[PDB]
Amino acid sequence: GITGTWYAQLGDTFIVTAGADGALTGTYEAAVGNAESRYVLTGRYDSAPATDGSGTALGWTVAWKNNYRNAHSATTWSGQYVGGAEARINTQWLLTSGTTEANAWKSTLVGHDTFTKVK
Amino acid sequence: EAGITGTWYNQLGSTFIVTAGADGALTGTYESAVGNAESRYVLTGRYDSAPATDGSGTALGWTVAWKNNYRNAHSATTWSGQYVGGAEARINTQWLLTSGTTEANAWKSTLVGHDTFTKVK
Amino acid sequence: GITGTWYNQLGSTFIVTAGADGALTGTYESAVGNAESRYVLTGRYDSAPATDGSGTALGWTVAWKNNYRNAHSATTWSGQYVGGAEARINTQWLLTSGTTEANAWKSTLVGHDTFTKVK
Amino acid sequence: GITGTWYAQLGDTFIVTAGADGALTGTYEAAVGNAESRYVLTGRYDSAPATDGSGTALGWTVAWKNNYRNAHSATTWSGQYVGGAEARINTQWLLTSGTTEANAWKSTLVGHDTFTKVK
């Protein structure tokens, strides 16, 4: 299932719960251990996916502010959960920083990340 | 407060209502252009609740999964962008829309676009 | 309809020829005036588009190196030409910088631009 | 070097020549089929990259029209070449289809692909 602890290619970890209603709620930790690198995450998923072998669509956001740090930026991940033995969540993400109007053209990075339940 | 809480309209007529929490939470309801109650979906997200005061915008993002009690598109959109407050407040976003696919078909799983929202229409 | 001079909302301009064979060839000026700000553009377009009112798919690339400057970057624009009283090319773009593998996660910006045809 | 034959995860292949002047030219072949599935590619690359362990920025376009078929669409790939033992080209891409105005919101797919010179 989606609920659990997930690991990114380069060590990021996130813990999420998938609610009956389609909610995602949890915490995203940018660096292994370390209280100062944990951030709130919230999102949504398709709680009644197709039964044709497709994945389950989802997305979530982290604003990079906690009680210790603020990067004045937020990342959204959009993707799907693929169940099985080696369950995976495959994503593409957008990272937007607060900018002046003149710098808005360079406000947003794009990338991709794959998460697995194994370290 | 920050001026995010309220009702916002995009260039295509979609509208959303949002409440910005003092802690960084975004909650609300997104209504696609066509349909009324059949077209309302849950939205949830996060924003920078302590933004810079140097002329920069306020970073945010939110997600809508396209399932409600009427319809299910087996898809979800995430919007990433910044809020520009004041007299002519706007939220400028780029978005990704992922539909559930097999891995073989994942190359056609994700659309990209951009939406600008105003508190006016 | 594509052949000609085009300008975007932020002031950049380009001049392009759409060849009978599908080629796009031209010059991109990142800043109106200023002859040290011209770069080679090349790309491709659909030379036999649908006749149902749909736009014409196209794309092009500029590497940001010329005789005077080198940003070690390249932008690609993907979009469609929409004919009209005021013709437009509506695009989304990706700007990738050369990075170390460690910084590859922040190698690529994403944005959008609309160009309007001069005269 | 960039010049050579490259392979994608799910069977696409392309052949490219990198000119001394920053030009990319070649042919892209979709996974299934052959000449029916071969298309012209053109692009640009940084012909003098940084000497600091950074990759080499590049981009190219394919319009999905050849003598046999026409999908009324085009893909642009933006990325970088990373040299050495296992040389790779890492990209993100945008695929735009010609659409009516009402369908323009869903004109553009986004993805990512890595290419290698090995099988």
Author numbering:
A (entry chain D), C (entry chain B), D (entry chain A): 16 to 134
B (entry chain C): 14 to 134
What does the paper say about this structure?
The femtomolar affinity of streptavidin/avidin for biotinylated targets, combined with resilience to harsh conditions and an on-rate of ~ 107 M− 1 s− 1, is the basis for biotin's central role as a specific biological “glue” in diverse research methods and biotechnologies. We previously generated streptavidin heterotetramers with exactly one, two, or three functional biotin-binding sites, through purifying tetramers containing defined numbers of non-biotin-binding “Dead” and His6-tagged wild-type subunits. However, tetramers with two functional and two Dead subunits can assemble in three different arrangements. To generate a controlled and stable bridge for bionanotechnology, we demonstrate here a method for the simple isolation of streptavidin variants with precise cis-divalent or 1,3 trans-divalent arrangements.
In the first instance, we placed a hexaglutamate tag at the C-terminus of core streptavidin monomer (termed SAe). The obtained 1,3 trans-divalent crystal structure was solved at 1.6 Å resolution, and cis-divalent streptavidin was solved at 1.4 Å resolution, with the phases in each case solved using molecular replacement. For the putative 1,3 trans-divalent, the electron density closely fitted residues 23, 27, and 45 only if chains b/c were SAe and chains a/d were D, confirming that the biotin-binding subunits indeed had a 1,3 trans orientation. The Dead streptavidin subunit has not been previously analyzed by crystallography, and the changes to the structure are localized to the mutated residues, consistent with the comparable thermostability of tetramers containing wild-type or Dead subunits. The overlay of D and a wild-type subunit bound to biotin illustrates how the three mutations in D greatly reduced the number of polar contacts to biotin.
